[PDB]
């Protein structure tokens, strides 16, 4: 079923900050804001951790959209191939979540990759989830109206304990 990362990295404080640093032309800014919150809260309701939003500067979890090279070892690659990627908890790049601007993203009302789904998967990595062998899990390694699976909940609660 679920996996963690080696040595179980996790956030150490009861509060974790996050910032949406850059946006996508595909959606209003407020729509991205509301979906990110919804994704975070899917995981947060299960565990003793609370998320605080910031609008400037560096936050623990930096979230954004980018084209091409964007300052880490994993540059984006144009339309297709890689869609998005995220990092396990830690300082600096740890926790951050990046989305390729050269895809099409949707809130559900148009063509595109469903952003809510994608953000819930990526932010699972940002909280310390690896990939699951269970096909029903949000953390299954491939993209394929939803909820966390029982395997997703068991894994996140193994790492943080229960709310």
């Amino acid at each position: 079923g679920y996996s963690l990362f080696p040595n179980s990295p996790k956030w150490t404080s009861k509060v974790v900050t996050y910032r949406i640093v850059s946006y996508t032309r595909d959606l209003p800014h407020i729509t991205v804001d509301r979906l990110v919150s919804k994704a975070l809260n899917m995981w947060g309701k299960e565990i003793p951790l609370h998320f605080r939003k910031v609008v400037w500067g560096t936050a623990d979890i930096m979230i954004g959209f980018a084209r091409g090279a964007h300052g880490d070892s994993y540059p984006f690659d144009g339309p297709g191939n890689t869609l998005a990627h995220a990092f396990a908890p830690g300082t600096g790049l740890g926790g951050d979540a990046h989305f390729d601007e050269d895809e099409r993203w949707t809130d559900g009302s148009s063509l595109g990759i469903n952003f809510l789904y994608a953000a819930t998967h990526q932010l699972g990595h940002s909280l310390g989830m690896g990939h699951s062998s269970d096909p029903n899990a949000v953390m299954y390694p491939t993209y394929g109206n939803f909820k966390l699976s029982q395997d997703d909940i068991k894994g996140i609660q193994k790492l943080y304990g229960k709310r």
Binding site: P9, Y74, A86, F87, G90, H125, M129
Partner: peptide
Amino acid sequence: XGAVX
């Protein structure tokens, strides 16, 4: 993609 660092 989930990377360590």
